[PDB]
Amino acid sequence: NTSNITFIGGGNMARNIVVGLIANGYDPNRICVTNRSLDKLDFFKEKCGVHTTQDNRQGALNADVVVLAVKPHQIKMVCEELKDILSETKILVISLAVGVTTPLIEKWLGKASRIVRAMPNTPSSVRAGATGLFANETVDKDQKNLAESIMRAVGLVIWVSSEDQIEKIAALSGSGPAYIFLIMEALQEAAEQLGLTKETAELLTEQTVLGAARMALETEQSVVQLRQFVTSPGGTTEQAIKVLESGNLRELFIKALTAAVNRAKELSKT
Amino acid sequence: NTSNITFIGGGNMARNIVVGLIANGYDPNRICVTNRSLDKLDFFKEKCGVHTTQDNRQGALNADVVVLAVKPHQIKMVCEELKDILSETKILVISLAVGVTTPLIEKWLGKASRIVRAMPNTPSSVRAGATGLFANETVDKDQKNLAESIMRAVGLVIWVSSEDQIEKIAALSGSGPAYIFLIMEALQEAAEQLGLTKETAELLTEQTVLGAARMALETEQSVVQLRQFVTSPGGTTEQAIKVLESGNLRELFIKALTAAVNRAKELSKTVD
Ligand SMILES: NC(=O)c1ccc[n+]([C@@H]2O[C@H](COP(=O)([O-])OP(=O)(O)OC[C@H]3O[C@@H](n4cnc5c(N)ncnc54)[C@H](OP(=O)(O)O)[C@@H]3O)[C@@H](O)[C@H]2O)c1
Ligand SMILES: NC(=O)c1ccc[n+]([C@@H]2O[C@H](COP(=O)([O-])OP(=O)(O)OC[C@H]3O[C@@H](n4cnc5c(N)ncnc54)[C@H](OP(=O)(O)O)[C@@H]3O)[C@@H](O)[C@H]2O)c1
Ligand SMILES: [Cl-]
């Protein structure tokens, strides 16, 4: 190892990843955060103890990895600002910009630009993010482990062979938390419909969701098999489940993710 | 962490508490699991390294705490089978059974001061469980602290003022993990329908659910407010939400929890 990582933009996602790295003992001297405004840089400067600058070029100078963490409308401007610094350099660029495809990023940066596109989600802010990654052709294996490692600082990381699967990631893990929020609400309010106080129902619902997710993660069993541990033949759970299967949830979700992916394609910048 | 704990029955709930306790550092030597059939005991003996025995009375013998982890319609006999051994000492008895009210247990055992009802769930295995606890006023504070110390080791604890609250908690967090497992199944198979691999769909689904609960748990913001914060207008997420909102999920879950409670109320007429 020996990687200088520069984050262009000092926003929420950059902060997520930087704090994740710092917390895992990543050398703070090997990190640079550039931001347009000074306020945000105070945090990175004082608390994180990483390098800060308001000059993207200075910031990117000598970096092995440049992470593009600016809002999507600023992505072309920052690229054009760094095209000369990053030209024929073998430097890895990680794009966090939603919707922005790699070929489009290549147009701005050069043709042999080494690009990884990340699709992280909101739970990144609580160190439980799910990130889908797509790697350019130019990206060498070392850089793929590097990209994966950096994004693992905020949660788990998967790869897709084709960049068109990113929109499917966005629809699943990108928009997924919202789905769970909706679910938790419905479940919460059902519990409250019975004689459970709002506070108890809220807490139990969240712990229940947390626990089922933890179990699924740390266990070999499928979610089907884990469901069996909960269900006794002719038991209470089985009756509640029969009702949930009444609602045709697989199909409900298929339409939901389809709507999401369709929208993602329309919003996709190429 | 010093009590001798004997689980009567070694099924799913027993297995998950025990796995949870061991994971928390609980001395395997202080735990005993019994079960009418032999095969289930193998896991406890070989994976957990805890005492196993096919004989309820032998397991209960030295226990400082006895956890009844048999079906609700098997609680009565188990209580009669052990009535004397339990009453003979201040052995704390924790019933996990749904639809077995303390009054019935007080009858089974002829005593009513060492009875705590606990409504745990399977994520206890990973120490991320949720357990409703109930105990009548006849149960002193140190017995209640004991039960709590034990259930707290595998996850959150919530004491409730009435027993029907426990049965409500049973339909929420007791059966809850199954609901989540079902949603996760539906979600990841939907993701596979769109063309993602099984492994990726499973992993992202799992992690997505975890992340959502985490965000929920780490803020005082409601789930609704988090949903808004996460949904931009005209965006990808909003499209999916609009589909989901038409699934009438609030009503689906209300209908589902109630059907769990009514079924619980059916079993309770049966446990005597
Ligand atoms: N949906 C998601 O959770 C997801 C996940 C990961 C990444 N992303 C993408 O990653 C990007 C970051 O999002 P975010 O919410 O973390 O950001 P944010 O907090 O809303 O703002 C990003 C930061 O970039 C800075 N910036 C803007 N123009 C700049 C420039 N020309 N040079 C240097 N810095 C500049 C801004 O600084 P000031 O405004 O303070 O001056 C701002 O603080 C977005 O494009 C987003 O789409 C999305
Ligand atoms: N599982 C859950 O998600 C959950 C959640 C909350 C509460 N609970 C409560 O926990 C209790 C146990 O449920 P579970 O799902 O864990 O049960 P389970 O896996 O179906 O079986 C419990 C075990 O008890 C054994 N048993 C039956 N009669 C016995 C006896 N007379 N003496 C000794 N052992 C006996 C059975 O042995 P054999 O099968 O080998 O005959 C069985 O293995 C229930 O009362 C339930 O209401 C469960
Ligand atoms: Cl150094």
TrEMBL record, chain A:
Pyrroline-5-carboxylate reductase catalytic N-terminal domain segment(s): 5-97
One of the record's GO cellular component terms: cytoplasm
Residues the record lists as binding NADPH: 56
Principal location: cytoplasm
Residues the entry annotates as binding NADP(+): 8-13, 35-37, 40, 56, 69-72, 98, 229
SUPFAM superfamilies to which the protein is assigned, alphabetical: 6-phosphogluconate dehydrogenase C-terminal domain-like (SSF48179), NAD(P)-binding Rossmann-fold domains (SSF51735)
Record pathway: Amino-acid biosynthesis; L-proline biosynthesis; L-proline from L-glutamate 5-semialdehyde: step 1/1
UniProt KW ATP-binding keyword: no
Residue span, Pyrroline-5-carboxylate reductase dimerisation domain: 163-267
Listed EC numbers: 1.5.1.2
Top enzyme class: oxidoreductase
Localisation per UniProt entry: Cytoplasm
Keyword terms: Amino-acid biosynthesis, Cytoplasm, NADP, Nucleotide-binding, Oxidoreductase, Proline biosynthesis
Molecular functions (GO terms): nucleotide binding; pyrroline-5-carboxylate reductase activity
Stated family: Belongs to the pyrroline-5-carboxylate reductase family.
HAMAP family found in the cross-reference section: P5C_reductase
Protein name from the UniProt record: Pyrroline-5-carboxylate reductase
Originating organism: Coxiella burnetii (strain RSA 493 / Nine Mile phase I)
